[PDB]
């Protein structure tokens, strides 16, 4: 208990600074003290050496605050309980928790196993997803900036995020510099709430309540500081304390080999899917140019020429995003377009990972006999190639103002699916590319009207999934079934002939016995 009472210092101080607002109007009394304290904590964290080594600055800030507030000054019973207890909690830390909470941060009934293992593994996955939470901080930053209320030059901070997203030379330096620029933006935000207003690059919204007009920037710089705290805890956990082949034992190892590499050879597919959702949601000629370049970057075949266009993909993203935000300035569609740029940035990052029969060999074993692969592995590998025609048909249901062509297409496919696997993969991929092209025509065609987007997008999604299947040497042994089932049919026909001959000569003898009985 003494560790929990001697370590919980910085978060409780930030809680005092967060609940220490609204003791008067916009002055140096309540809010500006907490703003300067959060800015001092930001300078201590981003100065890369005062993460826990500015106890002189902490004690001197407590000393200056208590000295000015105690030698300077129903309404006089909570402010002395606010800042009086602020100085009292600073001195109570100086007597209890300024030595222990700052010295330990140096650099020199069986739920307990699930609790500790989940804590350590959630910390590890939270670091690997704290790169992704720098991305999610960009996400919530824009989703509060351009989707709820415009912050203090929100275009500038979201633009810092915007060129921070695709570039790894920016990311470690520009992450801390973005925390510093968001802290300076919060300083300029709380310095803009003055009372001399005398009542397009400022947007002074005249913040009334003096608490709500900072939380979209205070929580933003605080999320960047939570990322900085995760980086510091990453350094601390580094100083202290599935395989691509071992997935074939159970479904949890499949989930481990999935979660480690969920975007690895899946990425550009989900990129195109998010592009499809963006084109569906945006409804603009900007989305028409977006879909023109997206379908053009689909129009070449492999994962190699498009891999050369993928730095050019990041190039048109960086050419598009800032101009789009400033042109809307002087949307939520732009927020999900930034999410699309985030997925494309992730792909542009991890494309060239050259660090790292065969697995095709246990697969004809793995079409009937597995621990738990086959129940899902060939339900994927066989019982989706028909289900795609079901979702083609329901896309032709809802609304088919012209969807009859893909009804006739799934008619041809529904007749020809037994033998289209029996084609070789060249013509298979030819006809699949033809089919996905004739799909992605119609979405941009339904963008040229100035509903029914989701079923076409889901059809497209399953089409990318089967394209991954139809390349794969994992699928070749499911395809090897079809040569056998094409060959052995006449033997089964002769088996039905022999079985019904057995039935007829089973019934003739019964009738002979009954006629003998009657005679």
Swiss-Prot record:
The chain crosses the membrane at residues 4-24, 26-46, 57-73, 76-92, 137-148, 152-165, 180-194, 212-239, 267-282, 285-300, 314-329, 332-353, 372-398, 403-421, 435-450, 454-470. Disruption phenotype: Embryo lethality at midgestation with defects in vascular remodeling. Conditional knockout mice in inner ear hair cells show no auditory and vestibular defects. It is found in: Endoplasmic reticulum membrane; Endoplasmic reticulum-Golgi intermediate compartment membrane; Cell membrane; Cell projection, Lamellipodium membrane. Residues 47-56, 166-179, 240-266, 301-313, 422-434 are cytoplasmic. Residues 25, 149-151, 283-284, 399-402 are extracellular. Expressed in bladder, colon, kidney and skin. Also expressed in bone marrow, liver, lung, spleen and erythrocytes (at protein level). Expressed in myoblasts (at protein level). Expressed in red blood cells. Expressed in cochlear inner and outer hair cells (IHCs and OHCs) and vestibular organ HCs. Belongs to the PIEZO (TC 1.A.75) family. Homotrimer; the homotrimer forms a propeller-shaped Piezo channel with a cation-ion conducting pore. Heterotrimeric interaction may occur between PIEZO1 and PIEZO2. Interacts with PKD2. Interacts with STOMl3. Interacts with TMC1, TMC2, PCDG15 and CIB2; the interaction may be part of the MET complex. Interacts with MDFIC (via C-terminus); the interaction prolongs Piezo channel inactivation. Interacts with MDFI (via C-terminus); the interaction prolongs Piezo channel inactivation. Piezo comes from the Greek 'piesi' meaning pressure. Pore-forming subunit of the mechanosensitive non-specific cation Piezo channel required for rapidly adapting mechanically activated (MA) currents and has a key role in sensing touch and tactile pain. Piezo channels are homotrimeric three-blade propeller-shaped structures that utilize a cap-motion and plug-and-latch mechanism to gate their ion-conducting pathways. Generates currents characterized by a linear current-voltage relationship that are sensitive to ruthenium red and gadolinium. Conductance to monovalent alkali ions is highest for K(+), intermediate for Na(+) and lowest for Li(+). This is Piezo-type mechanosensitive ion channel component 1. The chain holds residues 578 to 1346 of 2547 of the full protein.
